[PDB]
Amino acid sequence: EPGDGAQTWARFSRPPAPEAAGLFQGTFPDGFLWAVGSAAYQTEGGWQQHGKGASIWDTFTHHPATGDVASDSYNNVFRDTEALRELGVTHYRFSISWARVLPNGSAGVPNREGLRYYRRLLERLRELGVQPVVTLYHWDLPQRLQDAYGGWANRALADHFRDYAELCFRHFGGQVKYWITIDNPYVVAWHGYATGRLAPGIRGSPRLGYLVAHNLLLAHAKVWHLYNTSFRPTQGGQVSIALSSHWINPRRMTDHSIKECQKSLDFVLGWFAKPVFIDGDYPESMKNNLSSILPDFTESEKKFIKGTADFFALCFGPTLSFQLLDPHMKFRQLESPNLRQLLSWIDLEFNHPQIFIVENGWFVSGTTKRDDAKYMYYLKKFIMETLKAIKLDGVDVIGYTAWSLMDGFEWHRGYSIRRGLFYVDFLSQDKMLLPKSSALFYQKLIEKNGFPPLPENQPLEGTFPCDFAWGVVDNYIQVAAIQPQIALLQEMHVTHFRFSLDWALILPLGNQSQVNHTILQYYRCMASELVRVNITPVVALWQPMAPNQGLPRLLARQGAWENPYTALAFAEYARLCFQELGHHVKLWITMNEPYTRNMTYSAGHNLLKAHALAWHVYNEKFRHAQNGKISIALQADWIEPACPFSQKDKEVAERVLEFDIGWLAEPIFGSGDYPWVMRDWLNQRNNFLLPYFTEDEKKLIQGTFDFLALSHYTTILVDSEKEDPIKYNDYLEVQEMTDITWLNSPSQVAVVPWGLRKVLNWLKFKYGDLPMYIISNGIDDGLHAEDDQLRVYYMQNYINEALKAHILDGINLCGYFAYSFNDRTAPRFGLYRYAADQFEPKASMKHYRKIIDSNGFPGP
Template sequence: MSGLLLALLTFLAFTSAAAKPNAGLKTWGRFRKLPYPGDKAFLYDTFPDDFIWAVGTAAYQVEGAFEKDGKGLSIWDTFTRGGNRMATGDVGSDSYHNSQADIRAIGQLGVSHYRFSLSWSRIFPNGTRGSHNEMGTNYYRDLIKKLKDIRVQPVVTLYHWDLPDHLQQTLGGWSNPEMVGIFKDYADFCFQTFGDDVKYWITIDNPFVVALHGYGTGVVAPGIKNDPDLPFRVGHILLKAHAAVWHLYDRLYRPRQQGQLSMALASHWIKPSRTRLESLRECQCSLDHVLGWFARPLFTDGDYPPCMKERLGSRLPSFTPEERAQVNGTADFFALSHGAALSFQLVNDSLKFGQQEELDLRMLLYWINAEYDKPPVFVVQSGWSVLGNTKTEDPKHMYYLKRFIAEALKSIIIDGVNVIGYTAWSLIDGFEWHREYGIRRGLYYVDFNTLDMKREPKTSATFYRNIIQRNGFPELPENRPAQGIFPCDFAWGVSANSIQVETTPSQFSDPSVYLWNISNNGELIRLEGITAPPLRRTTHCADYATIRQQVDEIRQVGVNHFHFSLNWSAVVPSGDVAHPNSTLLGYYRCFTRQLLQANVTPVVTLWHHTRQRSSLPPPLDTANKWLNRETPEAFADYARLCYRELGAHVKMWITLNEPNDEMVGYQEGHQMLRAHALAWHAYDREFRHSQGGKVSLNLHMDWVEPAFSFSREDVEPAKRVLDFRVGWFAEPIFGSGDYPVGMRSWLRQLNSLELPVFNEEDRQLVKGTYDFFAISHFSTELVTHAKEDSYTYRAMLEVQHMIDTTWIMSPRPVVPWGLRKALNWVREHYCDVPVYVMANGVQEDPARFKDSLRVYYLYNYINEALKGETTNTHICCGAFFILMHCSQEQHVVITALVHCVINPLAGIEVFPLGLCMA
């Protein structure tokens, strides 16, 4: 049997057993059906024991020494000297002279593999064997030996974009079919020379960029952009060159060297702009034009995707049956590159076909698994970029690394994809191709202005090392759900900014006279000009239909507390408490009484701040608002009125709700503190003995976490933000009677600002004016002192605000453990003060997810509060959830939750995520 016939028969057998064409089309539907938000939650688990942890570089980006020791010019040496380009890789990171420093960095990371590329023109200066440069070859021999000495396996790329310039000038580079034989001969030399120590080979890195942007758009070397069909001819030759090298290795070297070989393919991810089959097909076609262009010939049938053939027609070269057999199956694993530059910046809009680009490594891995019949996938390049002026603190890079690694873990554990390794890109900062030195992608910082090019580990390097040491994200005790029950007197409540007020009972408000049903249609017909005499009937609480309706809704939820706010400007429109709105006060009196009759304790806020309205009576609102020296006294008088009128039914008062808004000035805040203190003392002296209630204020307290938990330099900014946000009001009341020391010193030293001063009288007035500590908590954010994004940088506090990209968003981050840390902060600063979470909830579109996010949010946030109880610290005394216009389904969810945790029956326990199980 001839070799050609055998190849054809093998090809036919392989294609008949391969995955069904376009099998990846099911990916979007599959992920759309996964449970939300549970599937988006962070997965704590570890990678397989034999998982490959790697880091990588490319020769032109880091080696430098572009003319040293006999090296020939590459197309990048020529390209960077033309046009409007401002920088070159002549020196780069100077790895040629600093290989020992690179080895030291690799050893510090603890990786098992190091991916690097050979500079073709350093080994063969003119691209052919006849120009062999022994010094260049020795450089790579020495590098491989040093890697083996520290037990790191090399992953070697034969071609990473830096073609010998001589081949470009004399042959036209990859546009010439002669390159197939030349590349094969170069590979043959490399296999002979280095192959005994190399078990993973990459023939060509990202042929999509080489073909389209090297020979089409001209964005990268060699910068050709005259022929729109040339990229497809170049891609054709690249595939043939790869296949020739694979067969060479398979025939001559694999039996002895036992290595594996592939081509590194890069891709974006894309989602349909509309949930229609046509949009899904356009997404599939977009991936086919970028990834499938090279992957389908290698992994499926040796030919291009039908979508490309249909749309490009004769512009796309065709394979003969023999060539298809030669190309198909020439990859031992799927080598995937994924990240900022390769996956996004270098994918033209024309290749998205009207669909939306998205960053989702997990879905891409699943698509590859389905489309190409479950190949082992080695992520050979993955990472993100930061600005060129970033030094050793790169939080954005670190959190994108976390995201990509977490998605790879889910791909293995949940989706069953055979991901065998992950390569963080890159080891050190270097020349970033068309972006030159405008961005950095290294785990190690390189100062390009110094002679020794010292490598300094960035925070992303520390993070990656920790991940490798733990082999992923093992579950820690604090990540495990708590099991147990809350104390019997725990306050369960819901909150509403305001209640619906209808001060005139509707059935007694209309004096008109009607005729009913005279046409047997059940309609009322008003008699013009006739009115009934005034009704001389005392209004009763039972007359208000709106009260009955609202109280019934609250009762159905199953809570034992309800928190709502009064409207100061409506209760005392004139500002004079001698002339209040008695009707409105009567309505509030009826409302609180009806709550008590339904076994629901009312919790009433006197003043609720919003950015849309001040809620101050008009005379104060137009007279400097809280800056008016009379406002605190007026507020105390208003508080006395409310205590007197409603105190018989209200035993829990909030004076000011979330006064610590960042839009509030320090002078305003000072006045608010005095107003709260006067209102508290008024209750304490005049009403507490007879009414027995409690009074405090409620502070907004989203948690602030250091972006680098292992860096002292970020712990201080997080503390600073909490001082300014929470300590601003908390410390004068619950602590020293003055503003936080750090807050005063920061403003004085860095901003030449002074906080208002408490005289001794005011200090004694404000300090200790609390009966409990009340907070509103919804989310968590990260802060760092490293400036990366001017939009989220706060110059006054010198902090950068950011989020962990693995967090669930809606639209703010859902971070349950932030509540526990907030509660711990209160306990650590103010000892055993009782704490109530007065507002907690999440924004969601219930029509989209059927309230599933709110269910997840409540279960997990409550579980974090429960952790304080199960450790016997008794941090939290109550929790209130935002009550909006809930659907019946939402009522059922909250009711079931509250019944589960506050009314445990015999044989029922609270299990992880708050689930009740018999």
């Protein structure tokens, strides 16, 4: 019964857990259908072939690119279904244009050519094992039924949509098991007639829109009561109607605002859904706020229209979300693309019918041809939401469909949009299809029945090797204050508290003829006491976050790092740090994670030289009398290929790594000079400022690394083809992307458990087996009802995946250090919160404690 939908915004304004919000596991139950979509003018092409009737869009495209040459699907059954066999999908959704068989203004002579076409297609689908989802209308109209009957304003056309739909049953037979009569009545009514953005009409008032919608909904009642009285006795499939429906969230979360949102949903979705499943009447709000421009039913058709459906077919995507949609219907509410709460609302408001999503998917621009990760990740998110509705919301779904099997013409966005699963170029006369990324992803999602648990996606028990390192990070410690620090570290079970010094504060002028020994003796006492409380400090020396790159004013004014002499300015300062503190350290970090897409190359040369001098110094003068190791902590945020089976993604991933990680790693770790692909790309693109290495420099840099502090915060995705003008970095020809289905942060930084294990394996595949630390890893707050529900997942899964690397691959770890043990020096990122001048343990910190005292997952 209506009204209970008000609980949907409540029930999905408070996520019970991120576990269920993501739903990284689970499978679709036995008998969950899968289909792929296609429209009657997106992909068919041709206007007079073999006797085709003219479309209203044939009339529309001529003067506001065309469908007289649209993808070539009217003559060949094998080419299209080759894509299907590659997909292995159980079902295939398409349409039938009305003008094709009956073009006249009286439903004249049927043309047998399209009939043989569709019989061949259905027979092929039978052979390969594909069942159809036919749609007797997709934004079409026979022109001769338009210039005489005034379009869908007049009633008689519902009679036509009766008879032509009866023959639609008789011509295609009984193997057509699922049916959808009117596809998206809302746009065809309003934007078809009122605004004129869709084919018919040029302009009108909302009166025409409401009348067209009334007439279409009556035509649906006609065709339903046709099927249920004349054809079903020899049948047993279902029939429904697809109602397109976006979803909105309120503005200020108030009762009036939720009322406005319910009103908008009824005005876009409820508009036809209410008198089909519930009572046979238009909604109360359209009765009230629309005074007399909304045609009302009589008691005979009030009953004639009720109950005329079996399952609920739902249409979703870019058709009327963030796209063509009456701005007066949103009633000043936020449009947002979510399908889980939407499915829950549709299931609650209609006495629990079964749901079938008959159109879903996003769009990629007209310039991208083969690699379109936008569509893959939107489809993955949509299937995730459908599964979460099946499992966590009790929305009994019967199947899912992905839209635009074949590229085409998005009506208003004309040809400037490409949506197909299979790329077709507009320069080929065969219109030859080629597989894309989306097709491969859908293939590997079908055959595995959703997202089944995988060896990597399933926790494998195991213990950590002894002497494993532990600790946490505060790279901004304020320099009395030591006792609460050590109390919070020892309380956290920390053995290697990570911090730095902010060198700029060590030396006011950058010279060692003067020093403010206060902070120096403070660090001395700090390290010493930490050892008395048994903490060996992971120490850093230089930080990347500063308006002057973190140098003293005098050392910054003279070319902070571009200058040659600054390298020695680092060197001697290192000697300082190693001659005073040199006893209480067992691990050092000189250049603590410099950023790698804004720092100039020539300065990078001097940074590597500085590292070389510092290492040679602490080796040839202090290592023998003071034990220890000294190496680098380099930024190694994993770059994954968007298409895991495309080569150009692999190459661009290599390049962006060699500029992020390899740029400051290849002379330190490997051969001793820059990576190959970075210099190849500098030279081939005729853009270059990099220095080269001289033999003395090469022998200076190479071979100084005693450990490897991989720094991994999140995982980013690369794409090779331009899709956006502002965010496709031309210099590297790189398009940065973040997947949408992952659990995200309130600051939009992704959590991916399996990332680390990859960047680990890579960094062994490249620089040989060696003791590896994971030095930086920590997400911020999340899900502001309990700020720990995401960091518990974060740690629980990242450390597990690290164990997984340590067990299944042989990547010899040494330790792990989560980031930001507090918020006061790290907004939103802490473990202990800072509230009212006090540090307070949040639950994820307790989870950390459990793992640390367990020293890894307690084995069998």
